[PDB]
Curated annotation (Swiss-Prot):
EC number: 2.1.1.346, 2.1.1.348
Subcellular location: Nucleus
Source organism of the structure: Caenorhabditis elegans
Name of the gene: mett-10
Chain sites annotated for binding S-adenosyl-L-methionine: 77, 103, 126, 159, 179
A GO CC annotation given for this chain: nucleus
Record note on quaternary structure: Self-associates. Interacts with dlc-1; the interaction is direct, and is required for nuclear localization of mett-10.
Record carries keyword Calcium: no
Name under which the protein is recorded: U6 small nuclear RNA (adenine-(43)-N(6))-methyltransferase
Domain of life: Eukaryota
Catalytic activity: an adenosine in mRNA + S-adenosyl-L-methionine = an N(6)-methyladenosine in mRNA + S-adenosyl-L-homocysteine + H(+); adenosine in U6 snRNA + S-adenosyl-L-methionine = N(6)-methyladenosine in U6 snRNA + S-adenosyl-L-homocysteine + H(+)
Amino acid sequence: EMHPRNPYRNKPPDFKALAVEYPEFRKFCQYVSNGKVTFDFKKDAAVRCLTQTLLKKDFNLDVEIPPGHLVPRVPQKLNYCLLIDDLLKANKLTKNVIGIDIGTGTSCIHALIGARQFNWKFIATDGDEKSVRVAHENVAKNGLSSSICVVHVNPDVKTVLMDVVNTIPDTDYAFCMCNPPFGEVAFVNRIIDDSVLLRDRIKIYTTMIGRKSSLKPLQNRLQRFGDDVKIMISVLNQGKTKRWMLAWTFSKSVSL
């Protein structure tokens, strides 16, 4: 009941099998006389290693998450990827899928997961320098330099996308992912300012959102374009997590 096509909905990771296959992960597994494998989720090292192990075993991705960073959760990021995959299916844009990932984080997890599981290509973007260092490192480790292009942006500029879409000027991109920096209204409104430009150059605009009451103004802004744009909102899995997805398109050739 996480997501219909998520491989983790009905095949939860077997921590004993992961312990056997990956020894650096089973140091964080508290195997005891209980007969089961016990795992502490309240320690950051354990969650970091769990994410690393899942990426290695299920996506052939050796990734480093450095200390003091967000620890990505593979199932939820994969849910975002699949939600984007379905809309490309409906609007039949599943040929040469070039997308733009914003705020990739330290690990470009959206870019790597898309390039591995969906064969996508990405223009990846982050505003934090150590994160772009580690992003270049991860892309080069996994050999996806021919699939993901990682670009640093100075966060001072209003534009988040127009400095990026310059990278390849003869391409009309398919979509953009974003995980906003954790207030959010200003960031997403900058994205929307880029959205009223570059109108059909990017077919579908998407972003996650964490703050609850950030939806009312943003949507208020989007419906200010009236019939010119289409708007859609979606949810995530795990229940207790509080994240939404917001998508919009000026294209009439698309259907959210």
